């Protein structure tokens, strides 16, 4: 009786890329089974977080420097859908490490 299209964004952020990819794949599969119009697992500039530091605790040696970097993976999954279907999808669709986040509304 309802079926009112909201257009819903799903955020997928994490570090361990493989897991993230798996999650994305799972989501797409689920979308396919509930059969909806959807934009894909859109990928953003994978932000590196750089912290560069003297390796020396105390500044007495050669000037060794280490760049400690954090790879981040930001993914948008756009759905042409109502909210109920999204809710149904997000009952499961959670795997450890990866951040599942629902933006909701266009």
């Amino acid at each position: 009786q309802e079926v009112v299209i909201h257009k819903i964004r799903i955020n997928l952020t994490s570090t361990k890329v493989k897991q993230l990819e798996n999650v994305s794949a799972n989501i797409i599969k689920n979308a396919e089974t509930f059969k909806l119009v959807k934009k894909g697992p859109v990928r953003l500039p994978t932000k590196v977080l750089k912290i560069s530091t003297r390796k020396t605790p105390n500044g007495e040696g050669s000037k060794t420097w280490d760049t400690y970097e954090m790879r981040i993976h930001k993914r948008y999954i756009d759905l042409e859908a109502p909210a109920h279907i999204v809710k149904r999808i997000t009952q499961i669709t959670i795997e450890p490490g990866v951040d599942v986040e629902v933006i909701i509304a266009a």
């Binding site: 952020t13 932000k47 977080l49 954090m70 981040i72 930001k74 959670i94 450890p96 951040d99």
Partner: protein, 223 residues
């Protein structure tokens, strides 16, 4: 709640680190090793691994509940939003941190150091790791600081077969005569490792060839 995504992730990491440190400190008697945080909507699961799980548990909701409360107090979240589970680790021998803790305990109570190290090594071998190494730095009779390296099997020092292969554990052990430092590097066996590659990246192994008989007349075999 809600910051920049990167920032949020960083904060989460920091929180995890803090939690780990607390567990190392608080659950020292409890024989703690690792924390496994799972953050879902509403209920955040926190898995904790230890040798002495019973101690962690208490007498049904003793220490664990207290820890939960502490966590809540630390990070503003309410009752129910944080859940804590204590689990048995699947063979402690491969786990470096646990071994280190055990060694520390052995040291603190009153035992032969070298012998203890050897025992630990033996235990590790029994468990089924490819190799292991114990280093004991500090005063081991006389004032001058002495290193004491004790090892079994291979120990890969270089390459990305380290971040994937060797569990490393560093601890300080406090003594009345001076502070000891125990480092322990453990060579987990490639096959049982599961995560990452299932064998050492340099190694190449070829299977046995299969025999085929030629000629024997061309012939025709029909259906």
């Amino acid at each position: 709640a809600i910051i920049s995504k990167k920032r949020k992730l960083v904060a989460d990491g920091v929180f995890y680190a803090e939690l780990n440190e607390f567990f190392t400190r608080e659950l020292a008697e409890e024989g703690y090793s690792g924390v496994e945080v799972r953050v879902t909507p509403t209920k955040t699961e926190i898995i904790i691994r230890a040798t002495k799980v019973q101690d962690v548990v208490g007498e049904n909701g003793r220490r664990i509940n207290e820890l939960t409360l502490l966590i809540e107090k630390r990070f503003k979240y309410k009752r129910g939003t944080i859940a804590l589970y204590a689990e048995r680790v699947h063979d402690r021998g491969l786990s470096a941190v646990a071994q280190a803790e055990s060694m520390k305990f052995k040291l603190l109570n009153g035992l032969a150091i070298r012998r203890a190290a050897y025992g630990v090594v033996r235990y590790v071998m029994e468990s089924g790791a490819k190799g292991c190494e114990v280093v004991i730095s500090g005063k081991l009779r006389a004032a001058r600081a002495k290193s004491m390296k004790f090892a079994d099997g291979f120990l890969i020092h270089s390459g990305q077969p380290v971040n994937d292969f060797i569990e490393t554990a560093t601890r300080h052990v406090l003594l009345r005569q001076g502070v000891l430092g125990i480092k322990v590097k453990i060579m987990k066996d490639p096959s049982r490792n599961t995560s990452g590659p299932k064998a050492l990246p340099d190694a190449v192994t070829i299977i046995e060839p299969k025999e085929e008989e030629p000629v024997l007349e061309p012939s025709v075999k029909d259906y």
